[PDB]
Amino acid sequence: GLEVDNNSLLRNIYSTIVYEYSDIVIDFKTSHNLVTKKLDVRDARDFFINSEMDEYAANDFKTGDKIAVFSVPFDWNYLSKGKVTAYTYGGITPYQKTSIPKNIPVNLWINGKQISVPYNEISTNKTTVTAQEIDLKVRKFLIAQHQLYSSGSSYKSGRLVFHTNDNSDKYSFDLFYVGYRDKESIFKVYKDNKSFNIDKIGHLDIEIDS
Ligand SMILES: [K+]
Ligand SMILES: [Zn+2]
Secondary structure (H helix, E strand, C coil), rough: HHHHHHHHHHHHHHHCCEEEEEEEEEEEEEECCEEEEECHHHHHEEEEEEEEEHHHHHHCCCCCCCEEECCEEEECCCCCCCCEEEEEHHHHECCCCCCCCCCCCCEEEEEEEEEECCCCCCCCCEEEEEHHHHHHHHHHHHHHHHCCCCCCCCCEEEEEEEEEECCCCCEEEEEECCCCCCCCHHHHHCCCCEEEEHEEEEEEEEEECC
């Protein structure tokens, strides 16, 4: 697709509302899905979240486990009376009683030039945080402050790299991945339920280029 079209696409895709719940129990766990118990009430209907993830990642959970959710939906189901289920990818971490707010340093380069990013721009209260949560916070920031996906923007490529301080290769997201041009494919990059120990993330390295 063309630059202008990819921008409009991603701008709309990442404008999608994010779901954040710190304490919920898994009602059902299957090979590659987790379904929460009632989260709350949205538009008069009882709200539930279904998380799709690689079987390898799902192996980490069992029915009854207490978990936290931070994810973006790609579909909704209203076929059941007084009920609504949002479908998402990963975004699941073990329940954490006490919040531990921590800022994650960010290094940003736009078209080769380094740009300062405030100390408190990206943060999380989790000791085990998903790459998805960080990505969502990063893109919201970039869209609001650095013209990411904006109309009239010349950007065409970019990446968010998690520069961890361990022996693992650096995990990253492609900021201009468009898949099949819909939420189902674009958000599918979160299916691995990738997460990090907060003390292992040294900082984030972001590149955006035209
Ligand atoms: K990726
Ligand atoms: Zn780095």
